[PDB]
Amino acid sequence: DGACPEVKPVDNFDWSQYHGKWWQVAAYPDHITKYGKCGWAEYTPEGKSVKVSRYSVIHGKEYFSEGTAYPVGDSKIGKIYHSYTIGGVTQEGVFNVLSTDNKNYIIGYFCSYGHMDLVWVLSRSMVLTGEAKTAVENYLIGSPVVDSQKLVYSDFS
Numbered sequence: 091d092g093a094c095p096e097v098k099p100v101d102n103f104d105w106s107q108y109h110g111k112w113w114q115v116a117a118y119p120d121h122i123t124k125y126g127k128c129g130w131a132e133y134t135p136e137g138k139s140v141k142v143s144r145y146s147v148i149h150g151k152e153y154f155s156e157g158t159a160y161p162v163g164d165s166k167i168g169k170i171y172h173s174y175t176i177g178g179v180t181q182e183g184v185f186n187v188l189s190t191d192n193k194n195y196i197i198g199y200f201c202s203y204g205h206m207d208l209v210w211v212l213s214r215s216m217v218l219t220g221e222a223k224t225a226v227e228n229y230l231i232g233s234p235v236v237d238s239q240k241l242v243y244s245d246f247s
């Protein structure tokens with residue numbers, strides 16, 4: 091119960107880091123079930139947009155999905171639009187970046203109407219270690235909205 095909490099996205103997001111391979115190292119279970127396990131995505135800059143090609147295993151079957159990403163308003167604010175096309179159905183939406191160091195990791199959040207929350211953590215490496223791990227932990231302890239106990243970490247074995 092409750093409406094979506096008011097989110098305070100970052101003020102320093104660097105869109106130039108939005109390229110290359112990002113591994114989805116953690117997420118809430120509902121996200122893993124809906125959008126799949128073993129998730130990774132390749133981001134390819136195309137002018138003002140970035141193209142997103144994503145792999146995951148959904149209900150035991152592998153899929154690639156495709157989407158386009160654009161910043162909404164000032165790119166520094168970390169409010170990002172993605173379209174998301176899989177199995178011939180397109181969806182679209184806006185999510186907010188809760189935390190990033192503009193180098194190793196990004197934490198994304200989406201909330202819809204009661205209300206359901208989804209959080210996912212992306213990294214340039216398959217495993218969150220050192221610097222990135224420490225930043226993520228500190229963020230979680232002060233975070234008004236992410237429940238750290240609910241995160242499930244990925245097993246890329």
Ligand SMILES: C[C@]12CC[C@H](O)C[C@H]1CC[C@@H]1[C@@H]2C[C@@H](O)[C@]2(C)[C@@H](C3=CC(=O)OC3)CC[C@]12O
Pocket residue numbers: 112114125130131144157172173174181182183184185200208210212
């Ligand atoms: C914002 C979004 C838009 C489509 C749908 O409404 C669901 C929401 C929440 C979930 C969100 C999609 C867009 C998608 O592109 C995502 C960002 C997608 C991911 C891409 C990625 O690198 O990590 C996750 C899986 C699902 C996703 O996390």
